[PDB]
Design a protein around this ligand. Structure first.
Ligand SMILES: COc1ccc(/C=C2\SC(=S)NC2=O)cc1OC
Ligand SMILES: COc1ccc(/C=C2\SC(=S)NC2=O)cc1OC
Ligand SMILES: [Mg+2]
Ligand SMILES: [Mg+2]
Lengths: 329, 326
């Protein structure tokens, strides 16, 4: 079973999902929670929506595995499992994150060569792919620089390097046939309300430098859904689960994008319905704070953190009592 | 294609590539890649020339059981692709350490109809280049079910029960049934055994007699183990270390025809030769013998000597293909 060929098809339906973080166990220093069941439920939801909408093309934009090092066998099994499920629905294009595995490019090249339903982009070189109904899509990829990031002493030369790669992708996008799609794995400059992860070693790109002649710019690396701009339509889908506290207010899920020649692109979010997070803050863990903690957590379907400033003696076994209390600090 | 041409099957069977090996790293490292790729290219071109229907790979394709080098893994995936372009490929891996191998194997088998990884005792039905249906009966190294070895008696009974199961499954054949095994046949004539650390030994009579061909890997020399059923180790493609001076190295082309005995030809690798030179003492007459031998010898030379002979003249630094003195 391969791709249809529709004459004069000027429409393209896209599923764009990202930042799965397969394999993550959260709060290992306090109360480890294996996020696999929740994450697989969200991925199943995304797969089912993609099949229901009959998307033509599936875009994955990196950090699909939580560990930059060797992932667990179960994490790799899940990643490959869902790749197969997505390939069964529509051709898949994969822009991986900044993983350490030196064989990743080799694996990506190999599976790209042996299947017309998956493409790994791991360089700045454009790739022409065919979507489910025969649409020709020029992929303009922008991965984390291959330690050209570390191989640079100069901030000015590195920024010029990145801009020159963006300019080249712009030129290639002009040589488009039907559709052009930018795929990037980086941090957009000046993101409203981004922790920055106390920033060090990120790739920061000005959103105005993303080639404006692409039909859609699919970004990954950021855990919250963000519509970055409308021309070109530029989106981070977000992660599928709330990975840690700080992500209480994020929107989580994937995005369905519809492109039509001569018309503006339209999209819908596919919400993941993630479990919620809550941080409870107290001056002191007194009896009034204890009943607040116990009563809140008992009716809260997600995970709870408790923060308190002042010493309050030996606390009772709160976590033994409360199954969804994962951290006290 | 579909013919079905269900009476004949042309097989290329090669094994034990040891991609990534550098030899004599403690004395004079020799990167074997250029010689090995030359042999692999020869095998590929022969497979294309004979228009084989099926390509069988039986393990130890990588030298390191640990994480292989990028260049070695690149070479492996490169030749897999070249072979897939010629005919469908069935891969029975050796005992590699990578815990992700089974996942990789499952994934690539699922996304391509031109390659199949067999990594358990489960039989797999595959289709050859001209539509022939081939039941693969695989026998890899026990999945550290070998480490699950309390008693030699219980372990051999486990191994024999798997062989019995493959025998029964081979009876459910349609066109051809092919055994693929990665192990050491018992009592191999002139096999060093590496003091048999962690080897799996199988009596050749226990290989299911109802298969049309039994493709074995793990042994570095070509061996016709028996004729019924035809059972072959192709050998490695290069002489990996001294001890393999007299081996035949290459691959094998096998032709099966139902109701006919199987036939095969060796595809010789033309490997570079190895030679060990022995002297009682390294005198000036022995040095000129060594120097003159190596000057006309197209392969790699080892010098062994019993008697103390003082500090050696620059024997190896002088001679580029003298790789070991011990
Ligand atoms: C065969 O093994 C692998 C297959 C795919 C990936 C993908 C990745 S990793 C990341 S971060 N973003 C991605 O899309 C990683 C693999 O090995 C760590
Ligand atoms: C994706 O990476 C790999 C792909 C194939 C193999 C095959 C092997 S290894 C062996 S021994 N015999 C074989 O056929 C090993 C890999 O990773 C070490
Ligand atoms: Mg990353
Ligand atoms: Mg082995």
């Amino acid at each position: 079973h391969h791709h249809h060929h529709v004459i004069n098809l000027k429409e393209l339906k896209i599923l764009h999902t990202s930042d799965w973080h397969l394999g993550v166990t959260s709060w290992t220093s306090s109360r480890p929670v294996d996020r696999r069941e929740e994450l697989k439920k969200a991925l199943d939801k995304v797969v089912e929506e993609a099949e229901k909408r009959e998307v033509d093309l599936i875009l994955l934009t990196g950090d699909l595995l939580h560990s930059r090092n060797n992932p667990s066998v179960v994490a790799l099994h899940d990643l490959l499992d869902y790749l197969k499920r997505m390939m069964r629905t529509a051709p898949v294009v994969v822009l991986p994150g900044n993983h350490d595995w030196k064989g990743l490019k080799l694996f990506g090249n190999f599976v790209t060569s042996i299947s017309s339903d998956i493409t790994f982009v791991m360089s700045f070189e454009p790739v022409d792919v065919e979507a489910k109904r025969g649409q020709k899509v020029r992929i303009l990829p922008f991965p984390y620089p291959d330690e050209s990031e570390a191989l640079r002493k100069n901030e000015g030369d590195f920024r010029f390097f990145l801009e020159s790669r963006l300019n080249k992708l712009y030129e290639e996008a002009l040589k488009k046939e039907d559709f052009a799609i930018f795929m990037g794995h980086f941090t957009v400059e000046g993101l409203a309300g981004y922790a920055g992860i106390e920033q060090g070693r990120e790739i920061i790109i000005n959103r105005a430098l993303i080639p404006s002649v692409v039909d859609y710019a699919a970004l990954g690396h950021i855990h919250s859904f963000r519509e970055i701009q409308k021309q070109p339509l530029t989106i981070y889908p977000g992660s599928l689960i709330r990975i840690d506290f700080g992500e209480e207010a994020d929107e989580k899920g994937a995005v369905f994008v519809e492109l039509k020649r001569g018309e503006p692109p339209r999209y819908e979010r596919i919400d993941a319905s993630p479990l919620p997070l809550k941080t409870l803050y107290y001056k002191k863990i007194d009896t009034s704070a204890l009943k607040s903690i116990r009563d809140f957590c008992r009716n809260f379907p997600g995970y709870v953190r408790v923060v308190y400033e002042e010493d309050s003696g030996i606390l009772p076994d709160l976590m033994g009592e409360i199954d969804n209390l994962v951290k006290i600090e």
